[PDB]
mmCIF file of C-alpha atoms and ligand atoms in Angstrom:
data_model
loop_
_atom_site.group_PDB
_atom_site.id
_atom_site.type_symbol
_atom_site.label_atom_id
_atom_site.label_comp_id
_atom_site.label_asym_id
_atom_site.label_seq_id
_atom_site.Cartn_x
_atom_site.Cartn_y
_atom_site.Cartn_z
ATOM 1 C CA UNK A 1 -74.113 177.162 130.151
ATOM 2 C CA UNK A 2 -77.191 178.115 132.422
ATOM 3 C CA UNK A 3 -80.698 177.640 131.448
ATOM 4 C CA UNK A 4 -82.927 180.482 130.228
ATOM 5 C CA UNK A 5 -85.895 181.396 131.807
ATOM 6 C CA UNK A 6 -88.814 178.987 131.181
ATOM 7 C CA UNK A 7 -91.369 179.705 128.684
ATOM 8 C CA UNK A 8 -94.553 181.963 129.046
ATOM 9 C CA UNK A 9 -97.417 180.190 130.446
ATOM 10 C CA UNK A 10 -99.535 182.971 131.599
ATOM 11 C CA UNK A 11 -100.687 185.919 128.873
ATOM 12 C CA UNK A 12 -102.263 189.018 129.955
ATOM 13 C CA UNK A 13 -102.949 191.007 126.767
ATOM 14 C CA UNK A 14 -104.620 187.865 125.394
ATOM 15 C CA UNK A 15 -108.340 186.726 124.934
ATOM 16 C CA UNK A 16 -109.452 183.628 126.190
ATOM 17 C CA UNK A 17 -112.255 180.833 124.826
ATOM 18 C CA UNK A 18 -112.708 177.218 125.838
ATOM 19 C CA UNK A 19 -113.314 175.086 122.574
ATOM 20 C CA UNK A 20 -114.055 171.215 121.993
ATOM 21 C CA UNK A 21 -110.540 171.076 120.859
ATOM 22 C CA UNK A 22 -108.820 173.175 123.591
ATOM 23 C CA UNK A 23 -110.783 170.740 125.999
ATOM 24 C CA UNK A 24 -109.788 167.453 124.202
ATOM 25 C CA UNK A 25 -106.095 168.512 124.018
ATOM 26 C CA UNK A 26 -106.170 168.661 128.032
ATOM 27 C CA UNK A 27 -108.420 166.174 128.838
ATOM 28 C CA UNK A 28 -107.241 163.525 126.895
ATOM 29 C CA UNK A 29 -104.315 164.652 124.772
ATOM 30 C CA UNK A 30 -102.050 166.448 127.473
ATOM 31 C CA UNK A 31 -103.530 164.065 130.791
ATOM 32 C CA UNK A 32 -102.781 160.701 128.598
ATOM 33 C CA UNK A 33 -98.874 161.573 128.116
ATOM 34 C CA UNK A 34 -98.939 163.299 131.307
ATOM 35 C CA UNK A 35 -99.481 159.783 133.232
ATOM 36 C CA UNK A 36 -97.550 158.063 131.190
ATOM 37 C CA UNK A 37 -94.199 155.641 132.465
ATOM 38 C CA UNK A 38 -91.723 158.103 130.710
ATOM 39 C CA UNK A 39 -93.696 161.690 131.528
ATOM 40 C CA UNK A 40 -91.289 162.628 134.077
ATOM 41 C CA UNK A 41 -88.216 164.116 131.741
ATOM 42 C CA UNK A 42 -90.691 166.013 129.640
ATOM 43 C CA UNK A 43 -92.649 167.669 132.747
ATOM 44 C CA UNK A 44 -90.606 170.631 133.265
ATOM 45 C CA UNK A 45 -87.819 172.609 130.678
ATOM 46 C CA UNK A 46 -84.536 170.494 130.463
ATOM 47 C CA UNK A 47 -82.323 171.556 132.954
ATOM 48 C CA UNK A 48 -78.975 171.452 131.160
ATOM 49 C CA UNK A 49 -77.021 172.623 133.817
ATOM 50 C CA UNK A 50 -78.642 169.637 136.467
ATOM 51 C CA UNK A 51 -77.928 167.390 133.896
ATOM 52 C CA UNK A 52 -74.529 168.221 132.399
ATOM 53 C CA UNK A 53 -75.708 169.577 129.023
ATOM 54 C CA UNK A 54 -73.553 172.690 128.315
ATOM 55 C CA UNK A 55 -74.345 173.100 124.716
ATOM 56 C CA UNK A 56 -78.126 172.005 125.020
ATOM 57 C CA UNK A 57 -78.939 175.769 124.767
ATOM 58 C CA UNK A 58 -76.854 176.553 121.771
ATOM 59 C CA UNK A 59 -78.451 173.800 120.214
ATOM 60 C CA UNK A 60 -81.997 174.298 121.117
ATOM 61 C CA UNK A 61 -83.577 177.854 120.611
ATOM 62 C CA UNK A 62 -87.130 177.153 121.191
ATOM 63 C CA UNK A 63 -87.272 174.345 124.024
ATOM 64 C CA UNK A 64 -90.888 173.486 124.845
ATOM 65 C CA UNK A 65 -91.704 170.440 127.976
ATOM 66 C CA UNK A 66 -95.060 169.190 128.719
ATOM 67 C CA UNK A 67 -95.081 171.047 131.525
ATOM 68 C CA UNK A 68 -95.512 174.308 130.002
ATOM 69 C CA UNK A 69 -97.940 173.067 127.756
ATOM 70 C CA UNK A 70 -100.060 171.727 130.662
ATOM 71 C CA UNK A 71 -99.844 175.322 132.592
ATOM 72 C CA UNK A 72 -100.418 176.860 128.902
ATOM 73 C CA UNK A 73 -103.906 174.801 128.685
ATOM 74 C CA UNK A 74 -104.671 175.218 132.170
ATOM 75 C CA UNK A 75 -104.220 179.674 131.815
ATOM 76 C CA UNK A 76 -105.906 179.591 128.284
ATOM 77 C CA UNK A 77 -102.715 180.824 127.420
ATOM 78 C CA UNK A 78 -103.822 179.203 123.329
ATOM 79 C CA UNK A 79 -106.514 180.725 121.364
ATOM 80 C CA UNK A 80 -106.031 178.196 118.761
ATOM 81 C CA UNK A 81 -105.703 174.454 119.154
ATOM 82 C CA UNK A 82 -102.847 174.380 116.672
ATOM 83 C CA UNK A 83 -100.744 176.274 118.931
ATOM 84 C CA UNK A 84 -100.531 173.755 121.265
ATOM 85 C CA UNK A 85 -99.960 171.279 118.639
ATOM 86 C CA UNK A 86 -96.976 172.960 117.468
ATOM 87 C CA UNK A 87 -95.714 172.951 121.368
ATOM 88 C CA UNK A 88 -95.983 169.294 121.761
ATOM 89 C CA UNK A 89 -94.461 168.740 118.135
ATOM 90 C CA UNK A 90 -91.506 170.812 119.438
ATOM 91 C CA UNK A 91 -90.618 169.457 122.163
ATOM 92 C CA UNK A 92 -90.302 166.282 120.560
ATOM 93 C CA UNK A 93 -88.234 167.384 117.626
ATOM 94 C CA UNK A 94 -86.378 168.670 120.058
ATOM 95 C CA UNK A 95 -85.220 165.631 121.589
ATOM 96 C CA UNK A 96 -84.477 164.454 118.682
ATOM 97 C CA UNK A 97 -82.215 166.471 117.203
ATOM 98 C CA UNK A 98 -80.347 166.515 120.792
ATOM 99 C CA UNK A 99 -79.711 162.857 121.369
ATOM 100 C CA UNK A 100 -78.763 160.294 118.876
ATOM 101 C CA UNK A 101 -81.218 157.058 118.006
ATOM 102 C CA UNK A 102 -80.505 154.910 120.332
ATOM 103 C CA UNK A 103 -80.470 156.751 122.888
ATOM 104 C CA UNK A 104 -82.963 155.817 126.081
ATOM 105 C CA UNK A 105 -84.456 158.837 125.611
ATOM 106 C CA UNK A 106 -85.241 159.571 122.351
ATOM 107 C CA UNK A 107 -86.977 155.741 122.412
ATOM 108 C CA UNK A 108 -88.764 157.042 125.304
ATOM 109 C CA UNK A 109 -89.580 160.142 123.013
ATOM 110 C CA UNK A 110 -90.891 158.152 119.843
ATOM 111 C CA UNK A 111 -92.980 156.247 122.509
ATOM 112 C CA UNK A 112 -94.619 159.304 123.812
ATOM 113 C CA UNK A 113 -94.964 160.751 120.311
ATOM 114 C CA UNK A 114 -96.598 157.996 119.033
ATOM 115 C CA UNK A 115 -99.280 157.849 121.864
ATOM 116 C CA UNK A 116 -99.784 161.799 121.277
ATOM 117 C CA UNK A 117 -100.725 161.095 117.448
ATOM 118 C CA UNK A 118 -102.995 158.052 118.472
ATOM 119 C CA UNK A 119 -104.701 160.678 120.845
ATOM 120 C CA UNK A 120 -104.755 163.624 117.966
ATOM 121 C CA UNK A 121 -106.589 161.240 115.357
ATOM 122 C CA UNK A 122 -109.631 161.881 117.795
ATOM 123 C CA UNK A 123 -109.398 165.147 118.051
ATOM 124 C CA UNK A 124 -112.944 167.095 117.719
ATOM 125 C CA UNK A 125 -113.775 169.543 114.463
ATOM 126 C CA UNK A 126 -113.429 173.113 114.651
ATOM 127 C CA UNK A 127 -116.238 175.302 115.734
HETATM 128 C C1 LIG B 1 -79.570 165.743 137.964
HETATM 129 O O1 LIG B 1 -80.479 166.542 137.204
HETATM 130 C C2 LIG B 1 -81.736 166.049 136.955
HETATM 131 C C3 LIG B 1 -82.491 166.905 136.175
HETATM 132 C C4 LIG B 1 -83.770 166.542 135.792
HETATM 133 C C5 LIG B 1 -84.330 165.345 136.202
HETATM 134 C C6 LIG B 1 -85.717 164.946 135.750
HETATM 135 C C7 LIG B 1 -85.706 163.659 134.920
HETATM 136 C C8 LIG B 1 -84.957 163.774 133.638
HETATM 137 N N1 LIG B 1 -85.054 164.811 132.831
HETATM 138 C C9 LIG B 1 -84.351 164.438 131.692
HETATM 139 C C10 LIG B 1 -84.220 165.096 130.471
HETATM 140 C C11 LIG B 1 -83.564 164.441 129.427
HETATM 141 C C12 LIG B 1 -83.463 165.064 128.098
HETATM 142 C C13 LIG B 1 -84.513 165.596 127.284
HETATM 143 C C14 LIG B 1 -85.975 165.661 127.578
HETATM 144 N N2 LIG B 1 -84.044 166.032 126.152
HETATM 145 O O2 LIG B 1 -82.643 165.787 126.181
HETATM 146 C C15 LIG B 1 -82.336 165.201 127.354
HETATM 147 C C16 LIG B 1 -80.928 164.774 127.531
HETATM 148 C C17 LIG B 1 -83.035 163.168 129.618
HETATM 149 C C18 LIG B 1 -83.160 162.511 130.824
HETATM 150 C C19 LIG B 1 -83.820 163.165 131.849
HETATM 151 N N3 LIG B 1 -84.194 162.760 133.116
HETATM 152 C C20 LIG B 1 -83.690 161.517 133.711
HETATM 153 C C21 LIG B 1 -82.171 161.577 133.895
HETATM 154 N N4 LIG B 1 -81.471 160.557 134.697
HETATM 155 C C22 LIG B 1 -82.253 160.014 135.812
HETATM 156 C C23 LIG B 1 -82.447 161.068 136.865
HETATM 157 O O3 LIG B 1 -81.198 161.543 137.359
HETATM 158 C C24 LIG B 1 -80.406 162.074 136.302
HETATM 159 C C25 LIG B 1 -80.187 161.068 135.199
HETATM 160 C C26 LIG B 1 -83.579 164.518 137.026
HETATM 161 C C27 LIG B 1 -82.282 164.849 137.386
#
């Protein structure tokens, strides 16, 4: 029932590039949901032993929180802004596929999500 470590953040044999995108997806993207009324759940991994979730990590084989994602942007740890895409589209199907509708916290989820794909629709071109 205890939690595994939390995800990478920090990648050594990795090269590193600041794009338009890469900067959108922190500075508006990731800052936006990051300020947001219902952040705090999704700002570090799900602690399922904190929170009396014994199964959460036989459920869930790739967690992903905004708070890795916001380290991940921060240590250039994506080369590719669809990589970080990906994250924030995982956590939230992770949520879902936790908790049931209805739940607080998947309508705190769908809230989040749906601020994250306003933000996306501005996202800058490709170099
Ligand atoms: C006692 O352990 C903790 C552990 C973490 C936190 C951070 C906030 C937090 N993190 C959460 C993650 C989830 C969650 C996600 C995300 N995916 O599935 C579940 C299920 C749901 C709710 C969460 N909440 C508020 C929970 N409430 C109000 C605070 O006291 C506990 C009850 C607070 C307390």
């Amino acid at each position: 029932s205890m939690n595994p470590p939390p995800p990478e953040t920090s990648n050594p044999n990795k090269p590193k590039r600041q794009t338009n995108q890469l900067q959108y997806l922190l500075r508006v993207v990731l800052k936006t949901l990051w300020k947001h009324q219902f952040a705090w759940p999704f700002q570090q991994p799900v602690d399922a032993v904190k929170l009396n979730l014994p199964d959460y990590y036989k459920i869930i084989k790739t967690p992903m929180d905004m708070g890795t994602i916001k380290k991940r942007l921060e240590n250039n740890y994506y080369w590719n802004a669809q990589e970080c895409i990906q994250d924030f589209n995982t956590m939230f199907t992770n949520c879902y596929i936790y908790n049931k509708p209805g739940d607080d916290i998947v309508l705190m989820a769908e809230a989040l999500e749906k601020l994250f794909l306003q933000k996306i629709n501005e996202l800058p071109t490709e170099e």
